[PDB]
A paper describes a structure:
In this study, we identified a novel role within the globin superfamily by showing that GLB-12 of C. elegans functions as a redox signalling protein in the reproductive system. We observed that GLB-12 shows a hexacoordinated haem, extremely low ligand affinity, a relatively low redox potential and the ability to transfer electrons to other molecules in a continuous manner. We found that, by using structural, biochemical and mutational approaches, GLB-12 actively converts O2 to O2.−, which in turn is used as a redox signalling molecule. Based on our findings, we propose a model whereby GLB-12 acts as a superoxide generator in the somatic gonad, after which this O2.− signal is modulated directly or indirectly by an intracellular and an extracellular SOD, creating a transmembrane H2O2 gradient that acts as a redox signal.
The crystal structure of the GLB-12 globin domain, refined to 1.65 Å resolution, further supported our current findings. It confirmed haem hexacoordination, with strong Fe-N bonds with the distal His92 and the proximal His127 residues. The proximal His127 is highly exposed to the solvent, which is the result of a hydrogen bond between the A-propionate of the haem to Ser126 OH. As a result, two water molecules are hosted at the entrance of the proximal site (hydrogen bonded to Ser126 OG and to Gln130 NE2, respectively), and four additional water molecules and one acetate ion fall next to the propionate. This exposure to a polar aqueous environment would favour oxidation of the ferrous haem, which is consistent with the low GLB-12 redox potential reported. In addition, residues Phe89 and Phe96 (surrounding the distal His92) are part of a wide cluster of aromatic/hydrophobic residues (Val54, Phe58, Leu59, Val62, Phe73, Phe152) (not highlighted). These could restrict E-helix movements required to achieve a pentacoordinated haem and would thereby limit ligand binding. Additionally, this aromatic/hydrophobic residue cluster creates a tunnel of about 50 Å3 in the globin domain, nestled among the B-, E-, and G-helices. Interestingly, this otherwise apolar tunnel shows a strong negative charge distribution at the solvent exit (resulting from residues Asp48, Asp49, Asp52 and Glu165). Further, while the haem pocket in globins usually prevents haem iron oxidation by creating a hydrophobic environment, in GLB-12 three polar amino acids (Lys88, Arg95 and Arg129) are located at the edge of the haem cavity, possibly to enhance solvent access to the haem and stimulate haem iron oxidation and O2.− production.
Author numbering:
A (entry chain A), B (entry chain A): 19 to 166, 182 to 215
């Protein structure tokens, strides 16, 4: 895909009002990078501890991990990716750039040897594992149900459609890029 | 993808009411196979004549094509695919089987040498070329605007989301299967 096609799932799964909600709800958050950090700490410590080694935090106490370079780097990168993606979708309506960003990010992960070897739709999809923790943990902050016009049901459904579309496009772009590289 | 995942784009782009509309509007049609036939006749004769050779109708007058085996066979297969897909989506809510059907069909086309050689997202996407003629020609039958509760705008938007999702999933499944086969 070039990115400008009419089949863009971010245009199909989300309408204009949905995209505005994604941006406005994300912006309502105070310290979104801190929330992203807390969720990644849960991912590597509680949910998928195989990821500690990947991020170089297999020895760091939970309390030191945010300072370790690969781990704190990833938190920054993931936060920036969500910042840009929600802005493109919900502010500029740059639907092409939003789709292109997600597929480029999916393809780029093929360089991660852990994922090249272990990413597997039959067994573990690590993009799904990570984003599912966001679905469970980020959405209650976004609805205001948890702390650190739109109804709770609306915000929940929109963020689920959005985050599931991020999973599917990163998964598909990764899988294709890996197949091509062989 | 197994098919049962939460990232299924037919569940994300279409809600239950949308899927019911897809099924009810398709069922309102009198002789849907005839309409499918007429649209394929336009595709091969007027829009993408490179396809005449593929379907063995490079000599048949337009008036004989429906009887030629590869061409009339394809019309039957495409009609059955839409019949099953709209039933799965809109009647049984078998969203897994709907997604699986579309990806299996995408993968199966890699066996078509014309597509293996020529299918190309940079240049011509033949699934997109075919389905776009359906978007232009089938939707006015579905809305009742042309001849052979839901508003015209609703029916048009739902069928566009649906048919665009069929294009994207056939395209992606095809591309992956071709890359794997090499
Ligand atoms: C789940 C959705 C994910 C998103 C949105 C995401 C986002 C990003 C971004 C934006 C970058 C830098 C730009 C780029 O390389 O494309 C990056 C790099 C990286 N990603 Fe991810 N990532 C995700 C999941 C994962 C997973 C499951 C792994 C497991 C290995 C992973 C490992 C890495 C690593 C090691 C880097 C290099 C930078 C670093 O180590 O901090 N990512 N990721
Ligand atoms: C655009 C969406 C399309 C749909 C939904 C579709 C559907 C189907 C189905 C359901 C079958 C039989 C089952 C299977 O093999 O999976 C089939 C076979 C086939 N498809 Fe397609 N098709 C599409 C596009 C195309 C295109 C663009 C070509 C161009 C080569 C093509 C060429 C063929 C051929 C040659 C067969 C074998 C049967 C025959 O020749 O009649 N199809 N297609």
């Amino acid at each position: 895909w070039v990115g400008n096609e009419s089949e863009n799932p971010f245009d199909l799964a989300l309408n204009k009002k949905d995209r505005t909600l994604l941006r406005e709800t994300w912006q309502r958050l105070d310290d979104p990078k801190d929330i992203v950090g807390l969720i990644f700490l849960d991912i590597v410590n509680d949910i998928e501890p195989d990821l500690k080694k990947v991020f170089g935090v297999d020895r760091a106490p939970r309390a030191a991990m945010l300072k370790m370079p690969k781990f704190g780097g990833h938190i920054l990168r993931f936060y920036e990716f969500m910042e840009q993606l929600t802005s493109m979708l919900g502010t500029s309506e740059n639907l092409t750039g939003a789709w292109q960003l997600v597929r480029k990010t999916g393809r780029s992960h093929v360089r991660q040897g852990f994922l090249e070897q272990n990413q597997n739709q039959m067994e573990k999809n690590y993009f799904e594992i990570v984003i599912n923790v966001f679905i469970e943990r980020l959405i209650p902050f976004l609805t205001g149900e948890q702390e650190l016009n739109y109804t709770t049901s609306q915000i929940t459904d929109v963020w689920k459609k959005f985050l599931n579309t991020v999973i599917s496009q990163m998964t598909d772009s990764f899988e294709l890029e890996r197949a091509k590289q062989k």
